[PDB]
């Protein structure tokens, strides 16, 4: 079962928030694809 990425804090850069969006999409892909 994949490791959930932590949301950045209040002071995050757009770089950190966009990186988070990609990590969250990767996590949710692993969650939804795992059983196949």
């Amino acid at each position, epitope marked *: *079962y*994949p490791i959930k990425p932590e949301a950045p804090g209040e002071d995050a850069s757009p770089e950190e928030l966009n990186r988070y969006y990609a990590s969250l999409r990767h996590y949710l892909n*692993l969650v*939804t*694809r*795992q*059983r*196949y």
Partner: antibody
Amino acid sequence: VQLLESGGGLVQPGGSLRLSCAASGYTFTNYWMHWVRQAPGKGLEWVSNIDPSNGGTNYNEKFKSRFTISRDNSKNTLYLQMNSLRAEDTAVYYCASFAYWGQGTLVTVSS
Amino acid sequence: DIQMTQSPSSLSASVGDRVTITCRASGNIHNYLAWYQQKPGKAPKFLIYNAETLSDGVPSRFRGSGSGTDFALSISSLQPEDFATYYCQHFMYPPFTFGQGTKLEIKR
């Protein structure tokens, strides 16, 4: 991304074969890994699966007494250990994980 | 065990046709359904998972719908490479059983 199968071929009834499936291109713990077979001219039949993140296994109870699924995370390899093979086990055996299928290997069980 | 009933077992159709294959689970599988295409002497190809999600590189003319026990695969406009055998498979609880398959052949 590929699953590459090895180990099929001809075995006498009551004999043993080990199939293997080498995965490449992604983290080996991402997806459950399944074995599926297809007798000549027939449909797909689900055999077993393993979760490489924790070794959890499911078996088609039809094969539970005779077949053992395993993997080695340090080799990116899935195994199926088939004991006490019978003529009715003649089939193409596939490994499958998410969108990735092995090429299949023909296992013939005959005298 | 949950069994999958696929219909029809064979379909004669033409390039351009809209076609539908159905798959009914004997128990609730939520959306844990995959569709596969298989051609003679080839490994199955994974088309759709979670009932409706297209796998990478699969053409948009393939669509899946369903939830619970009632599922369907639709091809909006058959192309020559679409004549093949189709199977559904559930991933709810083991055994992860397949439909018995639909053979999609060319009408003449």
